[PDB]
Amino acid sequence: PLSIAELGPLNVYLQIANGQCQTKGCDEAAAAYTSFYTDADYPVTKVLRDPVYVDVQILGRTDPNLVLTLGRCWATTSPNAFSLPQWDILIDGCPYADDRYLSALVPIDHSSGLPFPTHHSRFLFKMFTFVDPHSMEPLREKVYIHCSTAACVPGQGVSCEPSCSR
Amino acid sequence: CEVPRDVRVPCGVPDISPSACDAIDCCHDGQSCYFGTGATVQCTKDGHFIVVVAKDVTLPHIDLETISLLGQGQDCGPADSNSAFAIYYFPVTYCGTVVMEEPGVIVYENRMTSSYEVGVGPLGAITRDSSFELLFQCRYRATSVETLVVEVQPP
Amino acid sequence: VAVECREDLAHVEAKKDLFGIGQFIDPADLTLGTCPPSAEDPAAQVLIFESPLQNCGSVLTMTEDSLVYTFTLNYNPKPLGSAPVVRTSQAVVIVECHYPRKHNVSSLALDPLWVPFSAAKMAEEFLYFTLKLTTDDFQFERPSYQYFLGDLIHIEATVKQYFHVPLRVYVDRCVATLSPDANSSPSYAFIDNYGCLLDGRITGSDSKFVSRPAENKLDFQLEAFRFQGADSGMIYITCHLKATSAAYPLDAEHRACSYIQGWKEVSGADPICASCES
Numbered sequence A: 001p002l003s004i005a006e007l008g009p010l011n012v013y014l015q016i017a018n019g020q021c022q023t024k025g026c027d028e029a030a031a032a033y034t035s036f037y038t039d040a041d042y043p044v045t046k047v048l049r050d051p052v053y054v055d056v057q058i059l060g061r062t063d064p065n066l067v068l069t070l071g072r073c074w075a076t077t078s079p080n081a082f083s084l085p086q087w088d089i090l091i092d093g094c095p096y097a098d099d100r101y102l103s104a105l106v107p108i109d110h111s112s113g114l115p116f117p118t119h120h121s122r123f124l125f126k127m128f129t130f131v132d133p134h135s136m137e138p139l140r141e142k143v144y145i146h147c148s149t150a151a152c153v154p155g156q157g158v159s160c161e162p163s164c165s166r
Numbered sequence B: 001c002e003v004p005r006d007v008r009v010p011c012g013v014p015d016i017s018p019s020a021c022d023a024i025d026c027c028h029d030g031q032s033c034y035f036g037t038g039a040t041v042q043c044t045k046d047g048h049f050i051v052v053v054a055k056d057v058t059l060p061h062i063d064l065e066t067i068s069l070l071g072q073g074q075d076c077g078p079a080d081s082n083s084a085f086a087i088y089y090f091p092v093t094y095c096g097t098v099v100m101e102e103p104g105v106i107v108y109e110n111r112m113t114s115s116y117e118v119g120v121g122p123l124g125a126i127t128r129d130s131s132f133e134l135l136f137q138c139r140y141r142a143t144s145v146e147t148l149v150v151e152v153q154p155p
Numbered sequence C: 001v002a003v004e005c006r007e008d009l010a011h012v013e014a015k016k017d018l019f020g021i022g023q024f025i026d027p028a029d030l031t032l033g034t035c036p037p038s039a040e041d042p043a044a045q046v047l048i049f050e051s052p053l054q055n056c057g058s059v060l061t062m063t064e065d066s067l068v069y070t071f072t073l074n075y076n077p078k079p080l081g082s083a084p085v086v087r088t089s090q091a092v093v094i095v096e097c098h099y100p101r102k103h104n105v106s107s108l109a110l111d112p113l114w115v116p117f118s119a120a121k122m123a124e125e126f127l128y129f130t131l132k133l134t135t136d137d138f139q140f141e142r143p144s145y146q147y148f149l150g151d152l153i154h155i156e157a158t159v160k161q162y163f164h165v166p167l168r169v170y171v172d173r174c175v176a177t178l179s180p181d182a183n184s185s186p187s188y189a190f191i192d193n194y195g196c197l198l199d200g201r202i203t204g205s206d207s208k209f210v211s212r213p214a215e216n217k218l219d220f221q222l223e224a225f226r227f228q229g230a231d232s233g234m235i236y237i238t239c240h241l242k243a244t245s246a247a248y249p250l251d252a253e254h255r256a257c258s259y260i261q262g263w264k265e266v267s268g269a270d271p272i273c274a275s276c277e278s
């Protein structure tokens, strides 16, 4: 037999939603992901201790067998994901435990109503600002968020779901 | 001075005039005296500090468990308070208050400082708490003038 | 035969002349996996198949670095005519589409906002003082403010402590008059020069300070006098009081003096009143 083959693209993007309440007493976790910021809304000023919702999505796919899992997620001062200083957010999908303002995943999809709900991976944490390592005074340098992701297909047979010490 | 009425801490006494209430960094409404926006420090003839702090002084609204005086002790914690404000009431000889002399004034000084926590990881440091600092003095005036009267007659 | 691996569907351009022998082929006896879509192509002689990546029996597989979608392109011709003779063999083509599965997706800038607080407040207040008459033991009040000539009017000056640092009170000046106005004539400054009790020096009376029963307390005794031509015995004594911490020294201005056959005052610190000789 022949073995014709070619390459194929795969795109993912990360966006910020809004924890707004169209009615009093709305669920903030579900309402968070009802709308997202455009590039014109940035730099989005955020208060310290505020909740920050994060949505990662696989773009332009009709395959229902793909589940987006997250590896390390972190934040830096510059767009260079390898710049310093840094702060961890997620480790192997599990939250970064050395942070009393703990991060948490939000896989609400039984009610999200979105198509192919497993293509998305969502989580939230609390906003912060970086501190100079010797003056102990917080700096005013912008926060950038970054992640690492993997396509974790059950057909392959993997438990990429975060096995976490709760 | 848009304080909601369910959390209004009073100043002075019920009979206090509007001018007397405004002269002590408190707001009037025609029928009562209550502390205004920001923070306020007052002193009394008995020798105590009155410290009134609103939770909106800093951003984020500091969780009140984190603030401590220049000195620590039993009588150095918060007194009766409410959801929006906190009151510290203690003698001027307590809680690390410093005393100083001026040729015509007796000065007490104390400084509140909140310990805003810094979180540390292997690659950097962050924080989510805003720093707080409040310096304040009480200055008691000497040089009081007094008068009495007598009567003297021959024996 | 070629393939394009789009994001959500696969495009498979197979050739009509599959065997490359100038033969008809394809009497609809061919399928891509299980689906046999064919887009008529009477000019390029290319049968165009289309199939979603997860359909038509595709096999999704994974590697450390890549996903894989496999399609089985099958051709199983039926015998033509009333005979079992097949002109061409079956055909099978492995079709693989690989996809990178690991991506570092980042976000845009978020500006951290907070507001620290720094200020220097201040408030002022007055001390508490009293000048009062005392009985003859300096322990109790004497409301009978009437005395005879030559009697000893016992007087106490006090500053109230409450929770202040230990204080010491001083008499800076004391003037006697026949009316409440301190400047009204006649006037007699019987204490002046920062606590120099001049009466003991002027009249030879036994007028003198008394050792402090407490630092916030001060006591003294004054010999009664009138003014020549004064019909009334009323005297309106007006004084000025100071107070400082007991940590402050006894000095040329913060003193309490009296001329007892010389100068011996404030319970022993005599030289402090050396400047009352003026």
Ligand SMILES: *[C@@H]1O[C@H](CO)[C@@H](O[C@@H]2O[C@H](CO)[C@@H](O[C@@H]3O[C@H](CO)[C@@H](O)[C@H](O)[C@@H]3O)[C@H](O)[C@H]2NC(C)=O)[C@H](O)[C@H]1NC(C)=O
Residues within 6 Å of the ligand: A071, A072, A082, A147, A148, C104
């Ligand atoms: C996507 O993000 C991941 C982070 O999850 C990046 O992997 C990281 O790559 C750096 C090198 O660029 C690694 O740093 C190295 O660390 C070792 C000790 O672990 C040290 O000995 C080296 O000198 C170097 O500093 C880092 O460990 C690694 N992190 C993980 C979790 O593996 C990745 O490079 C990013 N970009 C991609 C995947 O294209």
Ligand SMILES: [Yb+3]
Residues within 6 Å of the ligand: B063, B064, B065
């Ligand atoms: Yb709290």
Ligand SMILES: [Yb+3]
Residues within 6 Å of the ligand: B080, B081, B082
């Ligand atoms: Yb209360």
Ligand SMILES: [Yb+3]
Residues within 6 Å of the ligand: C064, C065
């Ligand atoms: Yb590799």
Ligand SMILES: [Yb+3]
Residues within 6 Å of the ligand: C096
């Ligand atoms: Yb292969």
